[PDB]
């Protein structure tokens, strides 16, 4: 049973899954847009949105918070100095997911894009 | 016989004569009668009750017709109470006073594919002493050449829960008419937000 449980397992153990989200965040915040499988995508939204919201606080504490997942001062500088201001007046939802039309040839996996909002 | 539809909202205990008493709170009212079943017309006696207001955007024409003939706003749920004929055109929690005993029917929580141990309280297998991949297994399911088959109704693994359950003779602890609220002593089938039926008990 799975009654009222939140969070996909994604056939990864506790730390692989952590690293999975973190690495995707590094990639999302870097290129502004990535392609993944639909399930990874939907789960990535929250993980990244939180990081953006903290960059919206902007304080030392928040930066050090974000660095725990992002681990790259430059990347976080880009987060605070270029990305975060774009959302000053936006109330959550700094990410969107749209599903692509074609599946991966090799395993038939459904694909989607995750991008940062305008 | 009298009854009402309701939703299960949650559980608490209250205090009554220096005693803690577990209650399940149920939002029962208000239920408009939307059809009456009669011996000349239907062959038996009952009252079809509606419950919870619905966006008429989602109610189709055959359903609209039914409501309209009763002069009743569109409702989400229709359900009957046999051998119940309220003098009114609306049924509320006020039909139950504290101290009355009731039967509550709901839809039990669903465990999906349940092992024979969770479902039927089988003893399962030993967990050491050589036990071989049978720790949660049911054992024998039969005999031998005679009868050379397995009985109908053999308790076996399968789906469990998400089925109609009635717990009987529950004390009505309080009723708070202004909030369409019913407080019942003990445990009621199903999850919070679950549709339930409250009937006057059949025990004595």
């Amino acid at each position: 049973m799975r009654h009222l449980k939140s969070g996909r397992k994604l056939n990864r153990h506790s730390s692989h899954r952590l690293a999975l989200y973190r690495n995707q965040a590094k990639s999302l915040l870097t290129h502004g847009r990535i392609t993944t499988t639909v399930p990874k995508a939907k789960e990535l939204r929250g993980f990244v949105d939180h990081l953006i919201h903290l960059a919206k606080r902007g304080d030392l504490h928040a930066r050090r918070l974000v660095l725990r997942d992002l681990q790259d001062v430059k990347l976080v500088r880009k987060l605070f100095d270029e990305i975060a201001p774009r959302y000053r007046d936006r109330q959550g939802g700094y990410t969107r997911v749209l599903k692509l039309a074609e599946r991966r040839r090799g395993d038939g996996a459904p694909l989607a894009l995750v991008e940062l909002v305008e | 016989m009298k009854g009402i539809l309701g939703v299960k909202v949650g559980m608490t205990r209250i205090f009554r004569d220096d005693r803690a008493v577990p209650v399940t709170v149920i939002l029962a009212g208000p239920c408009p009668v939307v059809q009456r079943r009669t011996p000349e017309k239907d062959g038996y006696t009952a009252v079809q009750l509606g419950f919870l207001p619905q966006n008429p955007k989602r109610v189709n024409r055959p359903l609209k017709g039914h409501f309209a003939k009763a002069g009743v706003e569109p409702v989400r749920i229709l359900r009957e109470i046999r051998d119940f004929n309220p003098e009114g055109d609306t049924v509320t929690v006020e039909i139950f006073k504290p101290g009355e005993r009731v039967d509550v029917t709901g839809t039990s929580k669903g465990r999906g594919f349940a092992g024979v141990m969770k479902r039927w309280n089988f003893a399962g297998g030993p967990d050491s002493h050589g036990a071989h991949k049978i720790h949660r297994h049911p054992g024998s399911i039969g005999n031998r050449k005679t009868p050379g088959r397995v009985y109908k109704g053999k308790k076996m693994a399968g789906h469990y829960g998400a089925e109609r359950v009635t717990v009987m003779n529950l004390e009505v602890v309080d009723v708070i008419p202004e909030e369409n609220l019913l407080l019942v002593k003990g445990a009621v089938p199903g999850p919070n937000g679950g549709l339930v039926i409250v009937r006057e008990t059949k025990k004595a």
Partner: protein
């Protein structure tokens, strides 16, 4: 419908507001209404609260005391009607929220681990100075 608010709305008739705030580590005296056939009297229970498990009206707290060579723990509902009053007898300072570990400790060891929470003690004397 807001199922949560409904439940709090039921509980609201039973909610107490007259009790002093305490934390795990504090030493407390709970005066409890007790029945003994055929009269009811007030029995005092005094000890370290070693646990406060929160759930609104349904919060309960556990108090530990060593009575006549034997350890006793009592669990009280925080909004029980059978509680007359609670008297803060001492403020202790814990570093965690549950103190089950004091069960394995000498009276001496507990005394060191649960220093008097000097801060909240000063606050206690700081109020009580009333008009």
């Amino acid at each position: 419908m807001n199922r949560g608010a409904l439940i709090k709305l039921v509980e609201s008739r039973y909610v107490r507001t007259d009790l002093p705030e305490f934390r795990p580590g504090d030493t407390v005296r709970v005066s409890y209404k007790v029945k003994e056939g055929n009269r009811t009297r007030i029995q005092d229970f005094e000890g370290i609260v070693i646990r406060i498990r929160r759930n609104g009206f349904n919060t309960t707290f556990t108090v530990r005391k060593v009575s006549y060579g034997v350890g006793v723990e009592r669990i009280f509902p925080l909004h029980s009607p059978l509680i007359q009053k609670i008297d803060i007898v001492q403020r202790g300072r814990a570093r965690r929220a549950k103190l089950y570990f004091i069960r394995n400790l000498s009276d001496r060891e507990i005394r060191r681990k649960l220093r008097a929470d000097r801060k909240r003690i000063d606050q206690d004397r700081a109020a009580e100075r009333a008009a």
